[PDB]
Amino acid sequence: EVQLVESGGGLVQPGGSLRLSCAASGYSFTGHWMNWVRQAPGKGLEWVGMIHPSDSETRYNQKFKDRFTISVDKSKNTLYLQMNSLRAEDTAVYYCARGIYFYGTTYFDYWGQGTLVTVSSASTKGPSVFPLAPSSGTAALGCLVKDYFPEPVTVSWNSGALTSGVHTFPAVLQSSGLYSLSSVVTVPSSSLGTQTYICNVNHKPSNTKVDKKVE
Amino acid sequence: GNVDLVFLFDGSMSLQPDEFQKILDFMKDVMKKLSNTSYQFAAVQFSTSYKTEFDFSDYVKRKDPDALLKHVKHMLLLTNTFGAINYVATEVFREELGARPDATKVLIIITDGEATDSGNIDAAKDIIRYIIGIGKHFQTKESQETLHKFASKPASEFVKILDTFEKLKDLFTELQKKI
Amino acid sequence: DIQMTQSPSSLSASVGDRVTITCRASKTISKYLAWYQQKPGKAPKLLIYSGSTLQSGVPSRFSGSGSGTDFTLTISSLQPEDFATYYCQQHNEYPLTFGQGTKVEIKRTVAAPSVFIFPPSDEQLKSGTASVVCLLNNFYPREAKVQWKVDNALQSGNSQESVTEQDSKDSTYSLSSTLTLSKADYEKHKVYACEVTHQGLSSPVTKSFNRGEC
């Protein structure tokens, strides 16, 4: 299958640099134009620019041409976006998307999963995971992921063996400037006391993996 | 010794962006194989009118089939196969565009539909002409026989009708075990 | 540049209705407009290009129309899976510009929230803070009140909510409130309650627990 997997996002200070990666698979990487699109939290999509891997010909949005540099590595089937002199408004989800050049200019048919870039002058804080133990017929239980920076965190249950009745709530921001989210799962009420529940909390910016058994 | 080969590829409204893409990849795989070799290439898209996507002296400078064809756009119009071959005979096989007077003339035509025009291709009589008809339009002998007047004689060897665009892959490997 | 203007900014429609989203252009762009569907947390998904061409895999219930400045995406017979902001994009000239998106939400039948309450963990207490979590599970509409009470003292300004995005199947919402206190404060009081008001509830529902018990 056509696959676009991105890496390199995280926390970066104002005036700092960062290089994102886009690993492309399942098609001839040198046969399609590649694009970078970004999306600020709770806002719209912005085109950054394109690159043709074959010879690395580029076209930019002029809004981005100064501090953003798009390059390629045909040997690794990988696309890069080099960001420089970053500022708060550059906080966005950055997608790499494969484009079609056939009709008009360009539209995008295959997208990357995205990666969050947070521009802030704060420090990376890993989370604490506290059990939301079930009640003393349907029971709820969960994990409280607390006091982390920046976003995001991933939460799964039983290594992925459980998706039914799972609710990973959006992170909220608090006074401390740290995030905190809860992830809850509804289970049979009689299953407790014999069935094992473990939430898998991952915070890549801080290199914090936590396996938390609830009860 | 050395040969000048032109790809005359279909770009009509009956092609799907995927089927158009497969033709483009086919032309590349061919070039890639026939590289480190005394061949030089040119590619012309045809529909209602005709456009040289890259010429010979573009090829001998760039060499990369991927970089040479990156600006191609899908015409999405008709299939004027007659006017197209004449255009390749008078406009593309010129030293203005980088053609060699000692090199033998070869033409690979790729289409998925019957010609939407008429006339003759007498202008292209000293060009070796291959024609590749691709599926579901050449699903009847009568229609397959319409491509014979474009190709070199005998059709037995210069006409290939493929069942599906997925079969352009099959065709490429055929040519690899060929001499 | 070309300003793409979408209409409306958000909407709600019941399952099986005709949704018509309009995208308008700063100035003529022939027929070269594309539609994208973006689901929560996920990347945008191609639906239509060149004004009216359906992409391979996209259900024919999606339809693009228009040429020039006025374009329309028509989702005929809306589905629960069809919850996801829609963006339009011009592919006629550079730079490529998008619309601003239209949230398409799904009207369904009123659903009462199930209420669950979670005392702080003893693990978190060992650290000087107490988080009490109230959970409203699988309800509709999205709009609900949560009242935090500590021995009948209303707690205002020391709680934070989150609402899940529409269930792609089922069609509901879930809400999670977190009341945060010091250990000192928490261990000074007994009755911790969560009073939930919703349109689906006949009268407010309370879920409580007593400290040193839970």
Side-chain angles (χ1 to χ4, degrees), chain B residues 56-85:
Chain B
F56 298 108
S57 45
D58 284 332
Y59 170 84
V60 356
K61 186 198 174 165
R62 270 59 206 61
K63 274 262 143 44
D64 185 359
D66 284 309
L68 277 164
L69 284 147
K70 65 157 130 63
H71 294 109
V72 168
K73 306 203 157 285
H74 197 167
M75 277 169 168
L76 271 203
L77 290 167
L78 302 183
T79 314
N80 292 335
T81 320
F82 278 95
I85 304 166

PDB file of all heavy atoms in Angstrom, chain B residues 56-85:
ATOM      1  N   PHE B  56      14.624  15.216 -27.840  1.00  0.00           N
ATOM      2  CA  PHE B  56      15.866  14.452 -27.803  1.00  0.00           C
ATOM      3  C   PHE B  56      16.966  15.142 -26.998  1.00  0.00           C
ATOM      4  O   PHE B  56      17.560  14.527 -26.115  1.00  0.00           O
ATOM      5  CB  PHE B  56      16.347  14.129 -29.219  1.00  0.00           C
ATOM      6  CG  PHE B  56      15.396  13.273 -30.000  1.00  0.00           C
ATOM      7  CD1 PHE B  56      14.655  13.811 -31.045  1.00  0.00           C
ATOM      8  CD2 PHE B  56      15.241  11.924 -29.694  1.00  0.00           C
ATOM      9  CE1 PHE B  56      13.765  13.018 -31.778  1.00  0.00           C
ATOM     10  CE2 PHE B  56      14.355  11.123 -30.417  1.00  0.00           C
ATOM     11  CZ  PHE B  56      13.619  11.671 -31.463  1.00  0.00           C
ATOM     12  N   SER B  57      17.216  16.418 -27.286  1.00  0.00           N
ATOM     13  CA  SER B  57      18.272  17.166 -26.599  1.00  0.00           C
ATOM     14  C   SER B  57      17.926  17.494 -25.138  1.00  0.00           C
ATOM     15  O   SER B  57      18.796  17.900 -24.359  1.00  0.00           O
ATOM     16  CB  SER B  57      18.672  18.421 -27.386  1.00  0.00           C
ATOM     17  OG  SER B  57      17.537  19.120 -27.860  1.00  0.00           O
ATOM     18  N   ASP B  58      16.656  17.312 -24.780  1.00  0.00           N
ATOM     19  CA  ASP B  58      16.237  17.302 -23.382  1.00  0.00           C
ATOM     20  C   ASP B  58      16.706  16.013 -22.738  1.00  0.00           C
ATOM     21  O   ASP B  58      17.236  16.028 -21.628  1.00  0.00           O
ATOM     22  CB  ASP B  58      14.719  17.407 -23.254  1.00  0.00           C
ATOM     23  CG  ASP B  58      14.206  18.801 -23.509  1.00  0.00           C
ATOM     24  OD1 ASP B  58      14.956  19.770 -23.272  1.00  0.00           O
ATOM     25  OD2 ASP B  58      13.039  18.925 -23.940  1.00  0.00           O
ATOM     26  N   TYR B  59      16.505  14.899 -23.441  1.00  0.00           N
ATOM     27  CA  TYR B  59      16.909  13.596 -22.929  1.00  0.00           C
ATOM     28  C   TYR B  59      18.418  13.510 -22.715  1.00  0.00           C
ATOM     29  O   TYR B  59      18.862  13.162 -21.625  1.00  0.00           O
ATOM     30  CB  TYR B  59      16.425  12.451 -23.830  1.00  0.00           C
ATOM     31  CG  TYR B  59      17.042  11.120 -23.456  1.00  0.00           C
ATOM     32  CD1 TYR B  59      16.504  10.342 -22.433  1.00  0.00           C
ATOM     33  CD2 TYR B  59      18.183  10.654 -24.106  1.00  0.00           C
ATOM     34  CE1 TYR B  59      17.081   9.128 -22.079  1.00  0.00           C
ATOM     35  CE2 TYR B  59      18.765   9.446 -23.760  1.00  0.00           C
ATOM     36  CZ  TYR B  59      18.211   8.689 -22.747  1.00  0.00           C
ATOM     37  OH  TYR B  59      18.794   7.491 -22.407  1.00  0.00           O
ATOM     38  N   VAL B  60      19.199  13.831 -23.748  1.00  0.00           N
ATOM     39  CA  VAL B  60      20.667  13.744 -23.664  1.00  0.00           C
ATOM     40  C   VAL B  60      21.292  14.701 -22.632  1.00  0.00           C
ATOM     41  O   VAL B  60      22.455  14.532 -22.246  1.00  0.00           O
ATOM     42  CB  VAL B  60      21.379  13.790 -25.078  1.00  0.00           C
ATOM     43  CG1 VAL B  60      20.374  13.828 -26.220  1.00  0.00           C
ATOM     44  CG2 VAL B  60      22.397  14.934 -25.187  1.00  0.00           C
ATOM     45  N   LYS B  61      20.511  15.681 -22.176  1.00  0.00           N
ATOM     46  CA  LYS B  61      20.926  16.546 -21.072  1.00  0.00           C
ATOM     47  C   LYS B  61      20.492  15.987 -19.708  1.00  0.00           C
ATOM     48  O   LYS B  61      21.306  15.885 -18.792  1.00  0.00           O
ATOM     49  CB  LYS B  61      20.397  17.974 -21.248  1.00  0.00           C
ATOM     50  CG  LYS B  61      20.927  18.948 -20.200  1.00  0.00           C
ATOM     51  CD  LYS B  61      20.096  20.217 -20.109  1.00  0.00           C
ATOM     52  CE  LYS B  61      20.578  21.087 -18.933  1.00  0.00           C
ATOM     53  NZ  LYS B  61      20.041  22.486 -19.040  1.00  0.00           N
ATOM     54  N   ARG B  62      19.214  15.630 -19.587  1.00  0.00           N
ATOM     55  CA  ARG B  62      18.633  15.197 -18.312  1.00  0.00           C
ATOM     56  C   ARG B  62      18.889  13.727 -17.993  1.00  0.00           C
ATOM     57  O   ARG B  62      19.371  13.405 -16.905  1.00  0.00           O
ATOM     58  CB  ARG B  62      17.127  15.480 -18.277  1.00  0.00           C
ATOM     59  CG  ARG B  62      16.731  16.849 -17.732  1.00  0.00           C
ATOM     60  CD  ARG B  62      17.345  17.983 -18.531  1.00  0.00           C
ATOM     61  NE  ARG B  62      17.495  19.207 -17.743  1.00  0.00           N
ATOM     62  CZ  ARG B  62      18.236  19.313 -16.639  1.00  0.00           C
ATOM     63  NH1 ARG B  62      18.890  18.260 -16.150  1.00  0.00           N
ATOM     64  NH2 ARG B  62      18.311  20.479 -16.012  1.00  0.00           N
ATOM     65  N   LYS B  63      18.542  12.849 -18.940  1.00  0.00           N
ATOM     66  CA  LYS B  63      18.745  11.393 -18.827  1.00  0.00           C
ATOM     67  C   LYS B  63      17.740  10.675 -17.926  1.00  0.00           C
ATOM     68  O   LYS B  63      17.452   9.492 -18.139  1.00  0.00           O
ATOM     69  CB  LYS B  63      20.186  11.056 -18.406  1.00  0.00           C
ATOM     70  CG  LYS B  63      21.163  10.966 -19.565  1.00  0.00           C
ATOM     71  CD  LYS B  63      21.372   9.516 -19.998  1.00  0.00           C
ATOM     72  CE  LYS B  63      21.524   9.382 -21.520  1.00  0.00           C
ATOM     73  NZ  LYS B  63      22.417  10.407 -22.161  1.00  0.00           N
ATOM     74  N   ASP B  64      17.210  11.392 -16.933  1.00  0.00           N
ATOM     75  CA  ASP B  64      16.284  10.815 -15.964  1.00  0.00           C
ATOM     76  C   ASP B  64      14.851  10.880 -16.488  1.00  0.00           C
ATOM     77  O   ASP B  64      14.290  11.968 -16.616  1.00  0.00           O
ATOM     78  CB  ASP B  64      16.410  11.547 -14.618  1.00  0.00           C
ATOM     79  CG  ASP B  64      15.557  10.924 -13.508  1.00  0.00           C
ATOM     80  OD1 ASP B  64      14.843   9.923 -13.751  1.00  0.00           O
ATOM     81  OD2 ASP B  64      15.609  11.450 -12.373  1.00  0.00           O
ATOM     82  N   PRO B  65      14.256   9.709 -16.796  1.00  0.00           N
ATOM     83  CA  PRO B  65      12.863   9.623 -17.248  1.00  0.00           C
ATOM     84  C   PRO B  65      11.854  10.210 -16.254  1.00  0.00           C
ATOM     85  O   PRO B  65      10.824  10.744 -16.672  1.00  0.00           O
ATOM     86  CB  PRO B  65      12.641   8.115 -17.407  1.00  0.00           C
ATOM     87  CG  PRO B  65      13.996   7.558 -17.624  1.00  0.00           C
ATOM     88  CD  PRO B  65      14.890   8.378 -16.754  1.00  0.00           C
ATOM     89  N   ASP B  66      12.152  10.108 -14.956  1.00  0.00           N
ATOM     90  CA  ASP B  66      11.303  10.680 -13.908  1.00  0.00           C
ATOM     91  C   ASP B  66      11.288  12.208 -13.955  1.00  0.00           C
ATOM     92  O   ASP B  66      10.220  12.828 -13.936  1.00  0.00           O
ATOM     93  CB  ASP B  66      11.757  10.199 -12.524  1.00  0.00           C
ATOM     94  CG  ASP B  66      11.334   8.768 -12.231  1.00  0.00           C
ATOM     95  OD1 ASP B  66      10.136   8.445 -12.395  1.00  0.00           O
ATOM     96  OD2 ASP B  66      12.199   7.966 -11.817  1.00  0.00           O
ATOM     97  N   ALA B  67      12.476  12.806 -14.027  1.00  0.00           N
ATOM     98  CA  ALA B  67      12.619  14.258 -14.083  1.00  0.00           C
ATOM     99  C   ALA B  67      12.163  14.833 -15.421  1.00  0.00           C
ATOM    100  O   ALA B  67      11.705  15.974 -15.485  1.00  0.00           O
ATOM    101  CB  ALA B  67      14.053  14.660 -13.796  1.00  0.00           C
ATOM    102  N   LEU B  68      12.292  14.038 -16.482  1.00  0.00           N
ATOM    103  CA  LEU B  68      11.892  14.462 -17.823  1.00  0.00           C
ATOM    104  C   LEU B  68      10.379  14.573 -17.989  1.00  0.00           C
ATOM    105  O   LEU B  68       9.898  15.395 -18.775  1.00  0.00           O
ATOM    106  CB  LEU B  68      12.464  13.517 -18.884  1.00  0.00           C
ATOM    107  CG  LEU B  68      13.906  13.741 -19.353  1.00  0.00           C
ATOM    108  CD1 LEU B  68      14.423  12.519 -20.095  1.00  0.00           C
ATOM    109  CD2 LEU B  68      14.021  14.987 -20.220  1.00  0.00           C
ATOM    110  N   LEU B  69       9.637  13.756 -17.242  1.00  0.00           N
ATOM    111  CA  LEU B  69       8.186  13.641 -17.415  1.00  0.00           C
ATOM    112  C   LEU B  69       7.359  14.223 -16.257  1.00  0.00           C
ATOM    113  O   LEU B  69       6.136  14.051 -16.209  1.00  0.00           O
ATOM    114  CB  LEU B  69       7.810  12.174 -17.654  1.00  0.00           C
ATOM    115  CG  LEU B  69       8.106  11.610 -19.047  1.00  0.00           C
ATOM    116  CD1 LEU B  69       8.466  10.140 -18.994  1.00  0.00           C
ATOM    117  CD2 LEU B  69       6.958  11.865 -20.017  1.00  0.00           C
ATOM    118  N   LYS B  70       8.027  14.930 -15.346  1.00  0.00           N
ATOM    119  CA  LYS B  70       7.385  15.421 -14.124  1.00  0.00           C
ATOM    120  C   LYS B  70       6.369  16.541 -14.340  1.00  0.00           C
ATOM    121  O   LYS B  70       5.539  16.798 -13.464  1.00  0.00           O
ATOM    122  CB  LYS B  70       8.434  15.865 -13.098  1.00  0.00           C
ATOM    123  CG  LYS B  70       9.290  17.058 -13.508  1.00  0.00           C
ATOM    124  CD  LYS B  70       9.864  17.748 -12.267  1.00  0.00           C
ATOM    125  CE  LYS B  70      11.360  17.969 -12.383  1.00  0.00           C
ATOM    126  NZ  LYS B  70      11.768  18.869 -13.499  1.00  0.00           N
ATOM    127  N   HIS B  71       6.435  17.206 -15.489  1.00  0.00           N
ATOM    128  CA  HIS B  71       5.526  18.317 -15.771  1.00  0.00           C
ATOM    129  C   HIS B  71       4.316  17.892 -16.599  1.00  0.00           C
ATOM    130  O   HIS B  71       3.451  18.715 -16.912  1.00  0.00           O
ATOM    131  CB  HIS B  71       6.265  19.473 -16.459  1.00  0.00           C
ATOM    132  CG  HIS B  71       7.299  20.127 -15.598  1.00  0.00           C
ATOM    133  ND1 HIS B  71       8.652  19.992 -15.827  1.00  0.00           N
ATOM    134  CD2 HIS B  71       7.178  20.915 -14.502  1.00  0.00           C
ATOM    135  CE1 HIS B  71       9.321  20.673 -14.913  1.00  0.00           C
ATOM    136  NE2 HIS B  71       8.450  21.241 -14.097  1.00  0.00           N
ATOM    137  N   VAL B  72       4.253  16.606 -16.948  1.00  0.00           N
ATOM    138  CA  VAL B  72       3.162  16.098 -17.779  1.00  0.00           C
ATOM    139  C   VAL B  72       1.806  16.333 -17.110  1.00  0.00           C
ATOM    140  O   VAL B  72       1.648  16.147 -15.902  1.00  0.00           O
ATOM    141  CB  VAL B  72       3.350  14.598 -18.126  1.00  0.00           C
ATOM    142  CG1 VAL B  72       2.084  14.015 -18.740  1.00  0.00           C
ATOM    143  CG2 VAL B  72       4.516  14.429 -19.077  1.00  0.00           C
ATOM    144  N   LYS B  73       0.844  16.769 -17.913  1.00  0.00           N
ATOM    145  CA  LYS B  73      -0.523  16.955 -17.457  1.00  0.00           C
ATOM    146  C   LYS B  73      -1.453  16.154 -18.349  1.00  0.00           C
ATOM    147  O   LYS B  73      -1.187  15.991 -19.541  1.00  0.00           O
ATOM    148  CB  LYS B  73      -0.887  18.438 -17.482  1.00  0.00           C
ATOM    149  CG  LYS B  73       0.102  19.289 -16.706  1.00  0.00           C
ATOM    150  CD  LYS B  73      -0.489  20.604 -16.256  1.00  0.00           C
ATOM    151  CE  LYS B  73       0.295  21.141 -15.066  1.00  0.00           C
ATOM    152  NZ  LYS B  73      -0.020  20.398 -13.799  1.00  0.00           N
ATOM    153  N   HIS B  74      -2.532  15.639 -17.764  1.00  0.00           N
ATOM    154  CA  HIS B  74      -3.503  14.836 -18.503  1.00  0.00           C
ATOM    155  C   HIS B  74      -4.371  15.731 -19.386  1.00  0.00           C
ATOM    156  O   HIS B  74      -5.111  16.583 -18.885  1.00  0.00           O
ATOM    157  CB  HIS B  74      -4.381  14.045 -17.530  1.00  0.00           C
ATOM    158  CG  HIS B  74      -5.125  12.908 -18.161  1.00  0.00           C
ATOM    159  ND1 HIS B  74      -5.742  11.926 -17.417  1.00  0.00           N
ATOM    160  CD2 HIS B  74      -5.334  12.583 -19.461  1.00  0.00           C
ATOM    161  CE1 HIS B  74      -6.311  11.054 -18.231  1.00  0.00           C
ATOM    162  NE2 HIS B  74      -6.079  11.430 -19.476  1.00  0.00           N
ATOM    163  N   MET B  75      -4.276  15.538 -20.698  1.00  0.00           N
ATOM    164  CA  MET B  75      -5.020  16.371 -21.644  1.00  0.00           C
ATOM    165  C   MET B  75      -6.537  16.240 -21.506  1.00  0.00           C
ATOM    166  O   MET B  75      -7.248  17.252 -21.531  1.00  0.00           O
ATOM    167  CB  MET B  75      -4.565  16.120 -23.086  1.00  0.00           C
ATOM    168  CG  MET B  75      -3.313  16.903 -23.460  1.00  0.00           C
ATOM    169  SD  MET B  75      -2.576  16.413 -25.030  1.00  0.00           S
ATOM    170  CE  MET B  75      -1.425  17.760 -25.282  1.00  0.00           C
ATOM    171  N   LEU B  76      -7.018  15.006 -21.339  1.00  0.00           N
ATOM    172  CA  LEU B  76      -8.448  14.727 -21.128  1.00  0.00           C
ATOM    173  C   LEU B  76      -9.353  15.185 -22.268  1.00  0.00           C
ATOM    174  O   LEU B  76     -10.449  15.696 -22.028  1.00  0.00           O
ATOM    175  CB  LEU B  76      -8.951  15.346 -19.816  1.00  0.00           C
ATOM    176  CG  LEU B  76      -8.888  14.599 -18.485  1.00  0.00           C
ATOM    177  CD1 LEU B  76      -9.938  15.195 -17.569  1.00  0.00           C
ATOM    178  CD2 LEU B  76      -9.114  13.101 -18.634  1.00  0.00           C
ATOM    179  N   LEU B  77      -8.899  15.011 -23.505  1.00  0.00           N
ATOM    180  CA  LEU B  77      -9.696  15.418 -24.658  1.00  0.00           C
ATOM    181  C   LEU B  77      -9.930  14.246 -25.624  1.00  0.00           C
ATOM    182  O   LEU B  77     -10.294  13.156 -25.176  1.00  0.00           O
ATOM    183  CB  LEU B  77      -9.088  16.656 -25.332  1.00  0.00           C
ATOM    184  CG  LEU B  77      -9.191  17.968 -24.535  1.00  0.00           C
ATOM    185  CD1 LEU B  77      -8.300  19.051 -25.121  1.00  0.00           C
ATOM    186  CD2 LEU B  77     -10.630  18.465 -24.429  1.00  0.00           C
ATOM    187  N   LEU B  78      -9.723  14.461 -26.924  1.00  0.00           N
ATOM    188  CA  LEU B  78     -10.020  13.429 -27.931  1.00  0.00           C
ATOM    189  C   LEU B  78      -8.831  12.507 -28.216  1.00  0.00           C
ATOM    190  O   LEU B  78      -7.912  12.410 -27.405  1.00  0.00           O
ATOM    191  CB  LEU B  78     -10.558  14.062 -29.223  1.00  0.00           C
ATOM    192  CG  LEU B  78     -11.822  14.931 -29.152  1.00  0.00           C
ATOM    193  CD1 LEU B  78     -12.207  15.391 -30.542  1.00  0.00           C
ATOM    194  CD2 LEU B  78     -12.980  14.196 -28.500  1.00  0.00           C
ATOM    195  N   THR B  79      -8.866  11.817 -29.354  1.00  0.00           N
ATOM    196  CA  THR B  79      -7.793  10.890 -29.742  1.00  0.00           C
ATOM    197  C   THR B  79      -7.479  11.029 -31.236  1.00  0.00           C
ATOM    198  O   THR B  79      -7.854  10.178 -32.042  1.00  0.00           O
ATOM    199  CB  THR B  79      -8.146   9.407 -29.387  1.00  0.00           C
ATOM    200  OG1 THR B  79      -8.663   9.337 -28.050  1.00  0.00           O
ATOM    201  CG2 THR B  79      -6.914   8.502 -29.495  1.00  0.00           C
ATOM    202  N   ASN B  80      -6.791  12.109 -31.593  1.00  0.00           N
ATOM    203  CA  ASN B  80      -6.475  12.403 -32.990  1.00  0.00           C
ATOM    204  C   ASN B  80      -5.192  11.724 -33.463  1.00  0.00           C
ATOM    205  O   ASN B  80      -4.214  12.385 -33.811  1.00  0.00           O
ATOM    206  CB  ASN B  80      -6.434  13.916 -33.229  1.00  0.00           C
ATOM    207  CG  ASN B  80      -7.802  14.568 -33.094  1.00  0.00           C
ATOM    208  OD1 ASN B  80      -8.836  13.921 -33.266  1.00  0.00           O
ATOM    209  ND2 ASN B  80      -7.811  15.854 -32.787  1.00  0.00           N
ATOM    210  N   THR B  81      -5.224  10.393 -33.484  1.00  0.00           N
ATOM    211  CA  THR B  81      -4.062   9.562 -33.798  1.00  0.00           C
ATOM    212  C   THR B  81      -3.422   9.865 -35.160  1.00  0.00           C
ATOM    213  O   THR B  81      -2.211   9.700 -35.327  1.00  0.00           O
ATOM    214  CB  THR B  81      -4.419   8.066 -33.709  1.00  0.00           C
ATOM    215  OG1 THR B  81      -5.276   7.851 -32.582  1.00  0.00           O
ATOM    216  CG2 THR B  81      -3.166   7.205 -33.563  1.00  0.00           C
ATOM    217  N   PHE B  82      -4.225  10.309 -36.126  1.00  0.00           N
ATOM    218  CA  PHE B  82      -3.679  10.660 -37.435  1.00  0.00           C
ATOM    219  C   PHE B  82      -2.812  11.912 -37.368  1.00  0.00           C
ATOM    220  O   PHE B  82      -1.629  11.860 -37.710  1.00  0.00           O
ATOM    221  CB  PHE B  82      -4.777  10.792 -38.494  1.00  0.00           C
ATOM    222  CG  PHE B  82      -5.202   9.477 -39.083  1.00  0.00           C
ATOM    223  CD1 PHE B  82      -6.300   8.787 -38.569  1.00  0.00           C
ATOM    224  CD2 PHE B  82      -4.490   8.913 -40.141  1.00  0.00           C
ATOM    225  CE1 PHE B  82      -6.689   7.565 -39.109  1.00  0.00           C
ATOM    226  CE2 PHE B  82      -4.871   7.693 -40.686  1.00  0.00           C
ATOM    227  CZ  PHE B  82      -5.972   7.020 -40.169  1.00  0.00           C
ATOM    228  N   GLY B  83      -3.401  13.015 -36.901  1.00  0.00           N
ATOM    229  CA  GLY B  83      -2.692  14.287 -36.747  1.00  0.00           C
ATOM    230  C   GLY B  83      -1.496  14.187 -35.818  1.00  0.00           C
ATOM    231  O   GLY B  83      -0.539  14.956 -35.944  1.00  0.00           O
ATOM    232  N   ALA B  84      -1.550  13.227 -34.899  1.00  0.00           N
ATOM    233  CA  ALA B  84      -0.484  12.995 -33.931  1.00  0.00           C
ATOM    234  C   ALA B  84       0.782  12.406 -34.560  1.00  0.00           C
ATOM    235  O   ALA B  84       1.894  12.855 -34.264  1.00  0.00           O
ATOM    236  CB  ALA B  84      -0.988  12.097 -32.814  1.00  0.00           C
ATOM    237  N   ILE B  85       0.609  11.402 -35.417  1.00  0.00           N
ATOM    238  CA  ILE B  85       1.747  10.740 -36.064  1.00  0.00           C
ATOM    239  C   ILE B  85       2.402  11.662 -37.095  1.00  0.00           C
ATOM    240  O   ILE B  85       3.626  11.663 -37.254  1.00  0.00           O
ATOM    241  CB  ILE B  85       1.345   9.384 -36.699  1.00  0.00           C
ATOM    242  CG1 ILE B  85       0.716   8.467 -35.639  1.00  0.00           C
ATOM    243  CG2 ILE B  85       2.556   8.706 -37.337  1.00  0.00           C
ATOM    244  CD1 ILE B  85      -0.022   7.265 -36.200  1.00  0.00           C
TER     245      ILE B  85
END
